[PDB]
Amino acid sequence: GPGFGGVFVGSFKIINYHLATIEERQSAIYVDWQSDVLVTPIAAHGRHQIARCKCNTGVYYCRHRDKSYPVCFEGPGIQWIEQTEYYPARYQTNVLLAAGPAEAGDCGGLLVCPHGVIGLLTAGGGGIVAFTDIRNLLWLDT
Ligand SMILES: [Zn+2]
């Protein structure tokens, strides 16, 4: 709904690795540190659907500005070394790159297209924003 609390698909929740809790991590069915993503069970009926597409455009929510921004982004791929307070200087996987506002508190924002959710806002700054492509996790739908 609001578009920042991660993706809720079926009885499962998809969120960023650095924003997840230990309890969620201890029950997680899927974990990727490189992609900065977990898929963990939750006792709820998720209303989200993962996008089974190859869209190069989408719309993502910026929390600190409270607005939806459209953007054309680069396909998934390995990304440059960048350091955060949560992670060391490392190359992330399944990264979607675009231009737009992004702040420290905006991590977890949803990028979507007409097919569903494509990724979660991973990091950004200086007018460049990155997302974790979750199109590979569509097996969750079942
Ligand atoms: Zn699409």
- Quick one: how far is CA 96 from the chain centroid? 9
Q: Name residue 40's amino acid.
A: T
Q: Which residues pair with 133 in a beta bridge?
A: 119
Which residues fall within 8 angstroms of residue 12, CB to CB, at 6 or more apart?
Answer: 29, 39, 40, 41, 42, 46, 140
Q: Which residues pair with 38 in a beta bridge?
A: 15, 31
3-class secondary-structure state, position 76: coil
32 Cα: distance to centroid of ligand 1 (angstroms): 23
- Compute φ and ψ for 27, nearest 5 degrees: -110, 5
The end-to-end CA distance of the chain, in Å, is 22
Q: Is residue 53 part of an annotated ligand binding site? A: yes
Residue whose tokens read 């201890």: 26
CA distance 26 to 135: 23
Q: Are 60 and 131 contacting, i.e. CB atoms less than 8 angstroms apart?
A: yes
3 Cα: distance to centroid of ligand 1 (angstroms): 17
Which residue in 7, 2, 12, 29 sits closest to 131, CA to CA? Answer: 7
114 Cα: distance to centroid of ligand 1 (angstroms): 6
| Burial category of 70 from C-beta neighbours within 10 Å (exposed 0-12, middle 13-18, buried 19 and up) | exposed
Cβ neighbours around 113 below 10 Å, total: 15
Torsion, Cα 109 9 49 101, to 10 degrees, reads: 0
CA distance 120 to 47: 16
Resolution in A: 2.6
Q: Name residue 115's amino acid.
A: H
- Provide the 8-state DSSP code for 75: P
Tokens of 27: 């029950």
Tokens of 117: 């959710």
Residue 93, sorted as left (phi over 0), alpha (psi -120 to 50) or beta, turns out to be beta
Q: Are 126 and 101 contacting, i.e. CB atoms less than 8 angstroms apart?
A: no
Which residue in 36, 39, 35, 12 sits closest to 25, CA to CA? Answer: 39
Q: Is residue 113 part of an annotated ligand binding site? A: yes
Which residue in 49, 60, 47, 46 sits closest to 132, CA to CA? Answer: 60
